[PDB]
Amino acid sequence: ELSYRQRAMYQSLRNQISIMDTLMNLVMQFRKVCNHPDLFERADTSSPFFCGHFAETGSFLREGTNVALGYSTRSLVEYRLPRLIWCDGGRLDKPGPGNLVAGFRSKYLNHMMNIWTPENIRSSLEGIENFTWLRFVDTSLQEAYRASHTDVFARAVDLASKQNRLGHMQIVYDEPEDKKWTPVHALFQICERENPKAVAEITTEGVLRDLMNIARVKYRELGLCRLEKAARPRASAPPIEVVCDSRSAVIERENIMFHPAMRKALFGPTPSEIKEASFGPRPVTLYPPRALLPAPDHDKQRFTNITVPSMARFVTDSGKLAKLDELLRELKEGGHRVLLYFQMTRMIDLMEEYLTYRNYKY
Amino acid sequence: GLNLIAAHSHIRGLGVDADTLEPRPSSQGLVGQEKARKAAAVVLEMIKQGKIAGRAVLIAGPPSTGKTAIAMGMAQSLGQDVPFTTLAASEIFSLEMSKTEALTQAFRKSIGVRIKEESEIMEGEVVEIQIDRSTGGAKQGKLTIKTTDMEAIYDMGSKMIDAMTKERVMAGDIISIDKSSGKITKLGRSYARSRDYDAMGVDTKFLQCPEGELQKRKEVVHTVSLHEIDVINSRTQGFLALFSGDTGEIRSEIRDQINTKVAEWKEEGKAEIVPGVLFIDEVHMLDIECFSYINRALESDLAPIVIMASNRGVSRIRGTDYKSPHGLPLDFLDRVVIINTHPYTPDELRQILSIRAQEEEVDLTPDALALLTKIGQEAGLRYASNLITTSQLIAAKRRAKQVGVEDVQRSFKLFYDPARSVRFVQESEKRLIGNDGVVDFSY
Amino acid sequence: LIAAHSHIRGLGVDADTLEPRPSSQGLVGQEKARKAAAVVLEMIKQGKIAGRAVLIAGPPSTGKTAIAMGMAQSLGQDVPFTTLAASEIFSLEMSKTEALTQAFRKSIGVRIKEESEIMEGEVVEIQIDRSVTGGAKQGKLTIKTTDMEAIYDMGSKMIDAMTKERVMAGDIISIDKSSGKITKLGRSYARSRDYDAMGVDTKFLQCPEGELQKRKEVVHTVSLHEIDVINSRTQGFLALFSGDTGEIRSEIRDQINTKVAEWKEEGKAEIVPGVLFIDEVHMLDIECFSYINRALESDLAPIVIMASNRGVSRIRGTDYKSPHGLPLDFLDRVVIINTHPYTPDELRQILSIRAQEEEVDLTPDALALLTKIGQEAGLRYASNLITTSQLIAAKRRAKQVGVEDVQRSFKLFYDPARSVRFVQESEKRLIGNDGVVDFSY
Amino acid sequence: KRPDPMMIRWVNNKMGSVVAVPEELLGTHAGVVFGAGP
Amino acid sequence: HRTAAHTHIKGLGLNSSGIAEKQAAGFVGQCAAREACGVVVDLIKAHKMAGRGVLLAGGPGTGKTALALAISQELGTKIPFCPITGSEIYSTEVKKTEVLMENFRRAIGLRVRETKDVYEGEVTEMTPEEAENPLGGYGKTISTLLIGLKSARGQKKLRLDPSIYEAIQKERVQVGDVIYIETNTGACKRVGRSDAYATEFDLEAEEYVPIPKGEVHKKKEIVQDVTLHDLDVANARPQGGQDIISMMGQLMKPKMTEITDKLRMEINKVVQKYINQGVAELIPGVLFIDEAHMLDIECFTYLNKALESPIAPIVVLASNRGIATIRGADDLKAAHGIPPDFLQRLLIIPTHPYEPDEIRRIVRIRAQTEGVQLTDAAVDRVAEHGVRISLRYCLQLLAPASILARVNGRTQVDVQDIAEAEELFLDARRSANILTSTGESGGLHGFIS
Amino acid sequence: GACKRVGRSDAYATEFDLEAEEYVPIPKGEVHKKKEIVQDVTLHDLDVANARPQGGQDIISMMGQL
Amino acid sequence: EGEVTEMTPEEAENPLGGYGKTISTLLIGLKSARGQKKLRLDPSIYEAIQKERVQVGDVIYIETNTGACKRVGRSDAYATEFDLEAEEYVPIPKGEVHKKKEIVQDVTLHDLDVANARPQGGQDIISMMGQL
Numbered sequence A: 001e002l003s004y005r006q007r008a009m010y011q012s013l014r015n016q017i018s019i020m021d022t023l024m025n026l027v028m029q030f031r032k033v034c035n036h037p038d039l040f041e042r043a044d045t046s047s048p049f050f051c052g053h054f055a056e057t058g059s060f061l062r063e064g065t066n067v068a069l070g071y072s073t074r075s076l077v078e079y080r081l082p083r084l085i086w087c088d089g090g091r092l093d094k095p096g097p098g099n100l101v102a103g104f105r106s107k108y109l110n111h112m113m114n115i116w117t118p119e120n121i122r123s124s125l126e127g128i129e130n131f132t133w134l135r136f137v138d139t140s141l142q143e144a145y146r147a148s149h150t151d152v153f154a155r156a157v158d159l160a161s162k163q164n165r166l167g168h169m170q171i172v173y174d175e176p177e178d179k180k181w182t183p184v185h186a187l188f189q190i191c192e193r194e195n196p197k198a199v200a201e202i203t204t205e206g207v208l209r210d211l212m213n214i215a216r217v218k219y220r221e222l223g224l225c226r227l228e229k230a231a232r233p234r235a236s237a238p239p240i241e242v243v244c245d246s247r248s249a250v251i252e253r254e255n256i257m258f259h260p261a262m263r264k265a266l267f268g269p270t271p272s273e274i275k276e277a278s279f280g281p282r283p284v285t286l287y288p289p290r291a292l293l294p295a296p297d298h299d300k301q302r303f304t305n306i307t308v309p310s311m312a313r314f315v316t317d318s319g320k321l322a323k324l325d326e327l328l329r330e331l332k333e334g335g336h337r338v339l340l341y342f343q344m345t346r347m348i349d350l351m352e353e354y355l356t357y358r359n360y361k362y
Numbered sequence B: 001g002l003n004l005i006a007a008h009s010h011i012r013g014l015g016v017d018a019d020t021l022e023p024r025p026s027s028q029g030l031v032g033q034e035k036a037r038k039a040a041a042v043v044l045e046m047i048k049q050g051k052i053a054g055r056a057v058l059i060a061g062p063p064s065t066g067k068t069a070i071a072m073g074m075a076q077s078l079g080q081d082v083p084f085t086t087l088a089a090s091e092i093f094s095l096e097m098s099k100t101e102a103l104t105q106a107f108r109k110s111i112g113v114r115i116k117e118e119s120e121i122m123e124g125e126v127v128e129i130q131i132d133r134s135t136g137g138a139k140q141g142k143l144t145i146k147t148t149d150m151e152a153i154y155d156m157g158s159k160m161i162d163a164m165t166k167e168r169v170m171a172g173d174i175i176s177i178d179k180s181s182g183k184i185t186k187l188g189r190s191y192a193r194s195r196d197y198d199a200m201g202v203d204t205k206f207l208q209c210p211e212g213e214l215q216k217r218k219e220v221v222h223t224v225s226l227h228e229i230d231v232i233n234s235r236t237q238g239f240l241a242l243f244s245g246d247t248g249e250i251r252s253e254i255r256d257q258i259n260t261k262v263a264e265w266k267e268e269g270k271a272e273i274v275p276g277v278l279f280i281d282e283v284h285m286l287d288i289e290c291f292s293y294i295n296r297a298l299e300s301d302l303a304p305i306v307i308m309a310s311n312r313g314v315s316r317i318r319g320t321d322y323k324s325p326h327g328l329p330l331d332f333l334d335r336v337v338i339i340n341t342h343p344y345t346p347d348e349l350r351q352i353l354s355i356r357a358q359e360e361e362v363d364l365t366p367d368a369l370a371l372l373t374k375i376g377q378e379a380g381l382r383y384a385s386n387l388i389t390t391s392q393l394i395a396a397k398r399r400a401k402q403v404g405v406e407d408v409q410r411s412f413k414l415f416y417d418p419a420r421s422v423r424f425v426q427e428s429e430k431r432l433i434g435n436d437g438v439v440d441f442s443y
Numbered sequence C: 001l002i003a004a005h006s007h008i009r010g011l012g013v014d015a016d017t018l019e020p021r022p023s024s025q026g027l028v029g030q031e032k033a034r035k036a037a038a039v040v041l042e043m044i045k046q047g048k049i050a051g052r053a054v055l056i057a058g059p060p061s062t063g064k065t066a067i068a069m070g071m072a073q074s075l076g077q078d079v080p081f082t083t084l085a086a087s088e089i090f091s092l093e094m095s096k097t098e099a100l101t102q103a104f105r106k107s108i109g110v111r112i113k114e115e116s117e118i119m120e121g122e123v124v125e126i127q128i129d130r131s132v133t134g135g136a137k138q139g140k141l142t143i144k145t146t147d148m149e150a151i152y153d154m155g156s157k158m159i160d161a162m163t164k165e166r167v168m169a170g171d172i173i174s175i176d177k178s179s180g181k182i183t184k185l186g187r188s189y190a191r192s193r194d195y196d197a198m199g200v201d202t203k204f205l206q207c208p209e210g211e212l213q214k215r216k217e218v219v220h221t222v223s224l225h226e227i228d229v230i231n232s233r234t235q236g237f238l239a240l241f242s243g244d245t246g247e248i249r250s251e252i253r254d255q256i257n258t259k260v261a262e263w264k265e266e267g268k269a270e271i272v273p274g275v276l277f278i279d280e281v282h283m284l285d286i287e288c289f290s291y292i293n294r295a296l297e298s299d300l301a302p303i304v305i306m307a308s309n310r311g312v313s314r315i316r317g318t319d320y321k322s323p324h325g326l327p328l329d330f331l332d333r334v335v336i337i338n339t340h341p342y343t344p345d346e347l348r349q350i351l352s353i354r355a356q357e358e359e360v361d362l363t364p365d366a367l368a369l370l371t372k373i374g375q376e377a378g379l380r381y382a383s384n385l386i387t388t389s390q391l392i393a394a395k396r397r398a399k400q401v402g403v404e405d406v407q408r409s410f411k412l413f414y415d416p417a418r419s420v421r422f423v424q425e426s427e428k429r430l431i432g433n434d435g436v437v438d439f440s441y
Numbered sequence D: 001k002r003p004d005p006m007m008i009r010w011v012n013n014k015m016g017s018v019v020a021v022p023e024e025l026l027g028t029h030a031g032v033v034f035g036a037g038p
Numbered sequence E: 001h002r003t004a005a006h007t008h009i010k011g012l013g014l015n016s017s018g019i020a021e022k023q024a025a026g027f028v029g030q031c032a033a034r035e036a037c038g039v040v041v042d043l044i045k046a047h048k049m050a051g052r053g054v055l056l057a058g059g060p061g062t063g064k065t066a067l068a069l070a071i072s073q074e075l076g077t078k079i080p081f082c083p084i085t086g087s088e089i090y091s092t093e094v095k096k097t098e099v100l101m102e103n104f105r106r107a108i109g110l111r112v113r114e115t116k117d118v119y120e121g122e123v124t125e126m127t128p129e130e131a132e133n134p135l136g137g138y139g140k141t142i143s144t145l146l147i148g149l150k151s152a153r154g155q156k157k158l159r160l161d162p163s164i165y166e167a168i169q170k171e172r173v174q175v176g177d178v179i180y181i182e183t184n185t186g187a188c189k190r191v192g193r194s195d196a197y198a199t200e201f202d203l204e205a206e207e208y209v210p211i212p213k214g215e216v217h218k219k220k221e222i223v224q225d226v227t228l229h230d231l232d233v234a235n236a237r238p239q240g241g242q243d244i245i246s247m248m249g250q251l252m253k254p255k256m257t258e259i260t261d262k263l264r265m266e267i268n269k270v271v272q273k274y275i276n277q278g279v280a281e282l283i284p285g286v287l288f289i290d291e292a293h294m295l296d297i298e299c300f301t302y303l304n305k306a307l308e309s310p311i312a313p314i315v316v317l318a319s320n321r322g323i324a325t326i327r328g329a330d331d332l333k334a335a336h337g338i339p340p341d342f343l344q345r346l347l348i349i350p351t352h353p354y355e356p357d358e359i360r361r362i363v364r365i366r367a368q369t370e371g372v373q374l375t376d377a378a379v380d381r382v383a384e385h386g387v388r389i390s391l392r393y394c395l396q397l398l399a400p401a402s403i404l405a406r407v408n409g410r411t412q413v414d415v416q417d418i419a420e421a422e423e424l425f426l427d428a429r430r431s432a433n434i435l436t437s438t439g440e441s442g443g444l445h446g447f448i449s
Numbered sequence F: 001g002a003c004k005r006v007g008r009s010d011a012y013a014t015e016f017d018l019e020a021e022e023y024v025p026i027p028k029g030e031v032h033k034k035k036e037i038v039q040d041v042t043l044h045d046l047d048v049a050n051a052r053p054q055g056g057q058d059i060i061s062m063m064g065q066l
Numbered sequence G: 001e002g003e004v005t006e007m008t009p010e011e012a013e014n015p016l017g018g019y020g021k022t023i024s025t026l027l028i029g030l031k032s033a034r035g036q037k038k039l040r041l042d043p044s045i046y047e048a049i050q051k052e053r054v055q056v057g058d059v060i061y062i063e064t065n066t067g068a069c070k071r072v073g074r075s076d077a078y079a080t081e082f083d084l085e086a087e088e089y090v091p092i093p094k095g096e097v098h099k100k101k102e103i104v105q106d107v108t109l110h111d112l113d114v115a116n117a118r119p120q121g122g123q124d125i126i127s128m129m130g131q132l
């Protein structure tokens, strides 16, 4: 019986009969799909529909051996703004001629009249005044000022450069005579200084450690990290872009949409930095200490929707081949390794690929 | 093309004499409603002159009397030169933002800022590019480009070499360059080089070489609504929210800054203001909190004209437990003028059915048109227009060339009109689920 | 621990004739309902029928949950048995419809078969190269059986696992090359003494034998809901456990339904239909019922078992009353199984079963009195007095629960009827439906 | 053959464990722990 | 294999003349409704009219849902059939009129030819080159990667853009891997190790794959089926580029958003260009709103705008209600539970209750479909319940009775097995009598009211 | 402390024949200008500015959602 | 546990070819308030010492289930080494130098729910944005 892939092809062929009730070529390609659907249209590495502009190659012969692959991917939705709006002060936050408000307001609201600047905090640092708690939350006036002004991504990178030392104190400062010692400048950091997690990392039988890992252990045990993706998005697009005929707009596109510091954080140190960090006479810290991009949940699909055909599908995509595989895996007890005959030459080549997948000798 | 035949596709305009605003008995797809079409013509004059801010007009009439038709006529007679915003009142009930936010945004979409900017643009067929990469690339390069009238070589700066290599420019490509910013758009491929394009499949189209000057000062006219400026200024890529729609409740101090900035641009002559129109269909679906907002949003120099349509009689205002004409509170109806649309006479029904039959591809015998006109009087204009499509499909299945009375009669038998369907539920009352939830499944 | 239905260990029916035994597997009486339930197990186990909604109806107690819980015990581990309380469908994360869709799809299993290779051997050598100040890692593992030795390259992921596991020479380890899990099993010889902090001593093992590699078939069962979650995301598969899944788009589920059919025809997957048990279904509202009407019509619908206590009762989100609290166009799709109140000879048997499960030794007189209390006050109340009387008897160091201990329990703890009387006899001192109360003596 | 200038090697066997350090890393900060800093 | 309520419905069972055969394609009767549903099928296949509505009006169990499923089979798998209940419109994430538009645009299909322009090969060499950023604060950055790709037929060295190198970093590529680089997206896929390195002695289950045949550089032609909703969504929450927004968009929780009409009108223009280029064809389809009485006055008001759209699908509504209160409009009652205003837009196909002999014939079709054998006495007995109680009820007995029969070893269902099924499995009305009779008394054994 | 690149001076406009660059005339006025500006804010502007990083400080805001 | 009194490599008796040094043991002296001990550690602990930047006089612990170490801080015995240093100084551990004891952990099952549904320790950008 035909596989579902064969069945779909065979159906699309009998749709042609609606014109005709070329039949010789039709019956010949009916014979092809009944041999294997890869004789008709071979399965290949595939991806969602891409809804975007790109620069395609016009000539293969003139391309040569050395070529630069620029990043041409661009949205077809193409939002066009005059530079009066997008560049020349129609954006309120960006200072310039014809935006005299923005430069003033930037300085005064973020520095002068900003409660988080160290000169302002230091006036309120005492008594029942509003920054009185700062003495005990394990952060400096400089760090308080940084956390108020950097965004949650930038703060998260800075948080990579930190150590769970209050959790280590729980391991060490343990006896009654240690009196649960805590740095007084970290006094209010209560839940960090005491929680079960740090202790469970250290015990010789990881009972409380395992109990906290159940969800991720179960996930991997089910093989859901390795199972084939049963669905994907049918279309995919790059972000919409402003089209504005200014050089500043082009510069700004690179600064935001291809943001260097975010990218550097995600992908980590460069090879020269690893050398300079490693051969120096003294240690040196790196902007991110490591690549901060997460590990992908799917071990094979990772961060892309590209899918690659497999030999498992190849066998099952022809009903004959699936049936033949079942009987060959017992005729192996008799031999007859090449007692096979074909009406089509390319079918013999496909059978070499199948046999080599089975590692069956000719 | 993509645009299929919809209910209103036959409406091309208002059908009104531009000199006197006298409506013609039929033109541009509108039949009858002459007093209503005259009033809608007076409103277009107000919209196009821009002088008056925040008038609200209500189109009041029974169902299927051309209230939307007249609204489509106005949109078509303003054309693309004016912001026209079409709001179903059901849309204001966002979960992303409050109702009044959604009403502010709708008002702000309906005022345009018109801005004129020149660019030099260079357009022609590429005769040649050479690039020397040494080996880091982009060290130097030369572009030869032509029109039918001129040819030139350009020495290229290194970032133009990056633009060229990014867009894979090759000999024969017809390109345009916005040289104020250096984006390349590949307008096409020259036919004269078709053999060079060995990788392009046979479906590939080819252009003729461009013509005239290689460089032109093209002038572009942009219209951007006040809402777009607001959303741009809301976050680092706020303009993306004009598409994904996840604008929060944009803070009102942002809008007030923008209102000041735009008045500055008007006095400097850097920009022009283009007041549009907001159309609110089924305005009776707004609630009492919306109406009290709209009251005061109208009283502003940056208010569009608003146009509203209602089918409702004396009906309960939403968000309250009392009834008012059109379903709208009298506090609001005080600031509104009403245009009323009447039912059609049979000769108007005949014409509307004819126009609908010519917009669709339907050859209709005179007796079928007479029969459909009788059905229109008795079942309503919408039902008869729906029967046109049906009868065509029935005629086609029996291979007939014209829709005959025979085909209309199949349609009338197969598809019930509203009144026949009401009788059906009354006779089938025990078998249908009543308002008490009771039903009997037995024979 | 002992719970309300811990004694229920099956449905108590003859597997051949489906005849309910009067007592079996902890179930007593209800024979018509238990026979009807035994037939529904056949529909489930055969799997051919999709989307049959069965309503267990009856007054409170009478074992509607007990029968449904007996079925779960009869299906065993492989079949899904999703239990919903209808109150779980109301959510702030997702619509009721989405909450129902997820629960329906939780009830369909997908039994994937995969083949894996595991290594096992004695580690003879381990070598790891580490970059200074960087992530770059490489290494080689020399591993042995009594009959093979080979040197395997290790990637960075292996080196992380190897050091997490503290793999050392002489350890017996196994490695599943598919999952990449490493497990230690013991040591071929003592832990070497020269180094300190070398960790806890392991089991001894003799060296593994035969080939290093072997192939092993492994079977995993996942619901269609798990597949939905995994495929609606690039990242965040923690949502499978955390909730937080959002309203998964329907075009994703369309794709999954096709692929699962394709996986079935290929022999990659076996679909295993189970049941959704909705308890107290009268808590659903009119929109939920309108969704369920058509969710049942899919060929991927599970069999849906429902329970209701309600008489003619108001439908939620609705002005009007209906039997069971369920709407009639919903009940048209539903067969009803009726449970009945118990005979005193049945109560005596049920209470005896509860006493055995709770390990309580009733005297025959205590059982007689508890049976009489069971008629007057209900089976649940009399079952609560079993545990209480056990405690009271123990405090006086009695060997067995006597009538005196049951009488004292009855004295201490009010029957749901006596409490209603107590409420009536103090209407002024309890707070009324209009909030008035008097605190003065 | 010469080892990778940047990689320190740990190796463990029946005799126990050793670490070996490239001479390119002695005289760096990485050498200090091995008693061979700048 | 699994049998559901509608597994016997295979089509409308019409002649080429468009007349219903009295029993065909799984149907019995409904002939006038099947003929009207035939004309709806032909309206859809004509793909010329936008925004026409159809109401299937008729009591519960009269085959309204069967007919809609038959339309879907007459149309076949090329055309979008988008079935929903009115209960699905009430998203917590987005406004109810948003899920109306999403489902309207799922009902419009597009077939498009796509050129994948791609590079393939075994990675022979790979070498980064760096920028010395002086004062960015993020340190150095890689300025390009040079990579050597080898296929069976030829070889290239590619100087990749940094954003394409980031794609290779995400894909964990190493020398000797076989990779795929789609220049459309700039995405990279690692296909495997080259078969030249095929060895057992690696702990990880590597994909050893043969060297790519043909040239390193290829163009692939692929025909894709998408809906307008897939394009809308792709462009609302972009994930296809190698920019930072696309990258982080793959890490954040999936989330529906109230896609604006600006995006929809922009995507119409995009699709119109694919049509004018000849790479696409429009396949407008049908949205089936089952349980349409569960919509509300805001939904119906929105359909009056939405159905005016010049690319709106065909909308089929089913309702089972007589004169009923419109939801969200508690003062307004109308036939079908549909506002009078919106009812004027629809063509109403009434469906009618079955005769005793039609019910008997449905029992046989359904028995054949579930694969169960009945005696004629059995078929008559079941048909009696279809007349006396309900069609749905009598069809539910076939599966129980087959098991009860098999339990006695008889392979054919006879009257004794239906007689037992009647008593094990009550209908709604026998159960409602138990409620009312017992409800004479309260106390312990009353039903809770 | 604000600054803006207006463009490249068009005295350099013929460095190349094509470059992706925006050539502008040299400013014809005085190179230094002193202006009295009366600036208005509100207490709410101060609230907003102190509650959260604003504008170009908060680039990740471009992702929307949370 | 202790302050690190000493760190001292031992060369191996069979050094590897082509390598400048081969280390067979890494001795660490640990001092607590109650004793002094020479830990003859496995050489692989060099990794933690470099990454944790362990100095003589820093307070550390070494856990036997991993063999790694963690730095608690610099001992306050050195708080006068400089007029200004960016160190928090921490007391010397007041336990034994070797702490082996049973520990009793009390958790609710809700704590296990949250510890699984909201894992706390994640090193990636999304975890770190999460916890902020």
Ligand SMILES: Nc1ncnc2c1ncn2[C@@H]1O[C@H](COP(=O)(O)OP(=O)(O)O)[C@@H](O)[C@H]1O
Binding pocket: B007, B008, B009, B011, B029, B030, B031, B032, B033, B062, B063, B064, B065, B066, B067, B068, B069, B070, B352, B381, B382
């Ligand atoms: N005067 C008219 N001329 C031409 N077409 C009309 C006229 N009035 C109504 N129609 C058409 O008849 C249908 C019903 O009128 P419409 O304006 O949609 O109803 P309503 O007034 O309820 O909004 C529409 O397709 C509309 O285009």
Ligand SMILES: Nc1ncnc2c1ncn2[C@@H]1O[C@H](COP(=O)(O)OP(=O)(O)O)[C@@H](O)[C@H]1O
Binding pocket: C003, C004, C005, C006, C008, C026, C027, C028, C029, C030, C059, C060, C061, C062, C063, C064, C065, C066, C067, C350, C353, C379, C380
């Ligand atoms: N027939 C029975 N056999 C055994 N135990 C029963 C039976 N009926 C009820 N029980 C037990 O008595 C208690 C009440 O029954 P339950 O099933 O909870 O009633 P409901 O129908 O209200 O859910 C449960 O602990 C249950 O185990």
Ligand SMILES: Nc1ncnc2c1ncn2[C@@H]1O[C@H](COP(=O)(O)OP(=O)(O)O)[C@@H](O)[C@H]1O
Binding pocket: E005, E006, E007, E009, E026, E027, E028, E029, E030, E058, E059, E060, E061, E062, E063, E064, E065, E066, E067, E320, E362, E365, E391, E392
């Ligand atoms: N004419 C018919 N021929 C065969 N089966 C039918 C027919 N009409 C209805 N059915 C079947 O009877 C059941 C009830 O029909 P259904 O379409 O669900 O009613 P409703 O109008 O409530 O949707 C379904 O199983 C359906 O397949």
